[PDB]
Scaffold this active site. Structure first.
Site, PDB file in Angstrom:
ATOM      1  N   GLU A 294      -0.130  -7.741   1.036  1.00 43.91           N
ATOM      2  CA  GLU A 294       0.525  -6.465   1.390  1.00 43.91           C
ATOM      3  C   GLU A 294       2.049  -6.598   1.400  1.00 43.91           C
ATOM      4  O   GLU A 294       2.738  -5.640   1.818  1.00 43.91           O
ATOM      5  CB  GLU A 294       0.038  -5.870   2.716  1.00 43.91           C
ATOM      6  CG  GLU A 294      -1.263  -5.062   2.600  1.00 43.91           C
ATOM      7  CD  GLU A 294      -1.109  -3.879   1.627  1.00 43.91           C
ATOM      8  OE1 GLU A 294      -1.781  -3.890   0.575  1.00 43.91           O
ATOM      9  OE2 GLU A 294      -0.305  -2.959   1.911  1.00 43.91           O
TER      10      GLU A 294
ATOM     11  N   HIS B  13       0.796  -1.220   0.000  1.00 45.42           N
ATOM     12  CA  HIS B  13       0.000   0.000   0.000  1.00 45.42           C
ATOM     13  C   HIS B  13       0.835   1.279   0.000  1.00 45.42           C
ATOM     14  O   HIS B  13       0.250   2.354  -0.185  1.00 45.42           O
ATOM     15  CB  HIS B  13      -1.011   0.023   1.174  1.00 45.42           C
ATOM     16  CG  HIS B  13      -0.405   0.287   2.523  1.00 45.42           C
ATOM     17  ND1 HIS B  13      -0.061  -0.728   3.390  1.00 45.42           N
ATOM     18  CD2 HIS B  13      -0.144   1.441   3.181  1.00 45.42           C
ATOM     19  CE1 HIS B  13       0.421  -0.212   4.506  1.00 45.42           C
ATOM     20  NE2 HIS B  13       0.376   1.104   4.411  1.00 45.42           N
TER      21      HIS B  13
ATOM     22  N   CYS C 174       5.560   2.616   7.166  1.00 45.08           N
ATOM     23  CA  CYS C 174       5.322   1.332   6.517  1.00 45.08           C
ATOM     24  C   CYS C 174       6.383   1.031   5.467  1.00 45.08           C
ATOM     25  O   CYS C 174       6.929   1.924   4.818  1.00 45.08           O
ATOM     26  CB  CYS C 174       3.942   1.280   5.886  1.00 45.08           C
ATOM     27  SG  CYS C 174       2.685   0.749   7.104  1.00 45.08           S
TER      28      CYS C 174
HETATM   29  C1  LIG Z   1       2.019   2.394   7.395  1.00 44.54           C
HETATM   30  O1  LIG Z   1       1.304   2.781   6.235  1.00 44.54           O
HETATM   31  C2  LIG Z   1       1.002   2.235   8.522  1.00 44.54           C
HETATM   32  C3  LIG Z   1       1.753   1.934   9.826  1.00 44.54           C
HETATM   33  C4  LIG Z   1       0.871   1.851  11.075  1.00 44.54           C
HETATM   34  C5  LIG Z   1       0.273   3.179  11.523  1.00 44.54           C
HETATM   35  O2  LIG Z   1       0.465   4.206  10.949  1.00 44.54           O
HETATM   36  N1  LIG Z   1      -0.558   3.171  12.704  1.00 44.54           N
HETATM   37  C6  LIG Z   1      -1.156   4.418  13.129  1.00 44.54           C
HETATM   38  C7  LIG Z   1      -2.571   4.424  12.566  1.00 44.54           C
HETATM   39  C8  LIG Z   1      -3.397   3.294  13.182  1.00 44.54           C
HETATM   40  C9  LIG Z   1      -4.591   2.886  12.325  1.00 44.54           C
HETATM   41  C10 LIG Z   1      -5.205   1.599  12.860  1.00 44.54           C
HETATM   42  C11 LIG Z   1      -4.355   0.400  12.480  1.00 44.54           C
HETATM   43  C12 LIG Z   1      -4.905  -0.890  13.030  1.00 44.54           C
HETATM   44  C13 LIG Z   1      -3.923  -2.032  12.792  1.00 44.54           C
HETATM   45  C14 LIG Z   1      -4.147  -3.136  13.798  1.00 44.54           C
HETATM   46  C15 LIG Z   1      -3.150  -4.275  13.661  1.00 44.54           C
HETATM   47  C16 LIG Z   1      -1.904  -4.035  14.508  1.00 44.54           C
HETATM   48  O3  LIG Z   1      -4.435   0.281  11.094  1.00 44.54           O
HETATM   49  C17 LIG Z   1      -3.253   0.190  10.384  1.00 44.54           C
HETATM   50  O4  LIG Z   1      -2.198   0.062  10.913  1.00 44.54           O
HETATM   51  N2  LIG Z   1      -3.418   0.249   8.956  1.00 44.54           N
HETATM   52  C18 LIG Z   1      -2.250   0.192   8.118  1.00 44.54           C
HETATM   53  C19 LIG Z   1      -2.696   0.215   6.664  1.00 44.54           C
HETATM   54  C20 LIG Z   1      -3.444  -1.042   6.228  1.00 44.54           C
HETATM   55  C21 LIG Z   1      -3.956  -0.900   4.799  1.00 44.54           C
HETATM   56  C22 LIG Z   1      -2.631  -2.317   6.358  1.00 44.54           C
HETATM   57  C23 LIG Z   1      -1.322   1.351   8.442  1.00 44.54           C
HETATM   58  O5  LIG Z   1      -1.735   2.393   8.864  1.00 44.54           O
HETATM   59  N3  LIG Z   1       0.098   1.157   8.203  1.00 44.54           N
END
Ligand SMILES: *[C@@H](O)[C@@H]1CCC(=O)NCCCCC[C@@H](CCCCC)OC(=O)N[C@@H](CC(C)C)C(=O)N1
Length: 162
Positions: free
Chosen positions: A53, A29, A130
């Site tokens: 992913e 993503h 990420c």
């Molecule tokens: C990189 O793109 C991010 C890294 C994590 C991040 O930024 N977390 C802060 C926002 C939290 C949003 C809720 C979490 C719930 C995950 C629970 C499992 C541990 O969502 C995500 O982390 N979403 C993720 C993107 C998806 C599409 C995989 C993300 O923000 N990644």
């Protein structure tokens, strides 16, 4: 060591990691959409393998010939302590220690993730991310086993190759 950190590269909305001179891994993503090249190379010269992913690019030519190849594994054993190689824009290196759990498929915010969950180690860390690689040490050798995909109970998920 520094050669390991030189592999962590800004990419799209996050980071990716050079496994070898020809192999780049990242989290799907954060990959740009609608581009004609990655790192100056035409799409026609890049073998793309992605799922859950996890995204791998294999280039036709040596892109980072300064690097040795290292081992990429599909996750790590439950209980392994990994370091997530987070870089800041300054180039500051912030390794995050994580205790790894189980590999599973998960739907996170719409995307199916094939990933391994883990928990941040409060006891091993100082009191846009990420794609950062999850690595661990085997001998004096470093192994990469996933890419940062999600975080929220100080829980993290790295996507892993299948
Ligand atoms: C990189 O793109 C991010 C890294 C994590 C991040 O930024 N977390 C802060 C926002 C939290 C949003 C809720 C979490 C719930 C995950 C629970 C499992 C541990 O969502 C995500 O982390 N979403 C993720 C993107 C998806 C599409 C995989 C993300 O923000 N990644």
């Amino acid at each position: 060591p520094p050669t390991l950190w030189s592999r962590v590269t800004k990419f799209g909305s996050g980071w990716g990691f050079w496994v070898s001179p020809t192999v780049f891994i990242t989290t799907t993503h954060v990959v740009p959409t609608g581009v004609k090249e990655f790192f100056g190379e035409p799409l026609s010269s890049i073998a793309i393998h992605q799922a859950g992913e996890f995204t791998q690019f294999r280039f036709s030519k040596k892109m980072r010939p300064d690097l040795t190849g290292m081992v990429l594994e599909e996750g790590c054993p439950e209980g392994t302590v990994c370091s997530v190689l987070i870089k800041r824009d300054s180039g500051e290196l912030l390794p995050l220690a994580v205790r790894m759990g189980a590999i599973a498929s998960m739907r996170i915010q719409g995307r199916l993730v094939h990933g391994q969950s883990g928990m941040l180690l409060t006891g091993a860390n100082a009191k846009g991310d990420c794609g950062a690689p999850y690595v661990h040490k085997r001998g004096n050798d470093w192994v990469v086993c996933g890419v940062h995909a999600a975080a929220t109970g100080n829980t993290v998920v790295c996507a892993v190759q299948a």
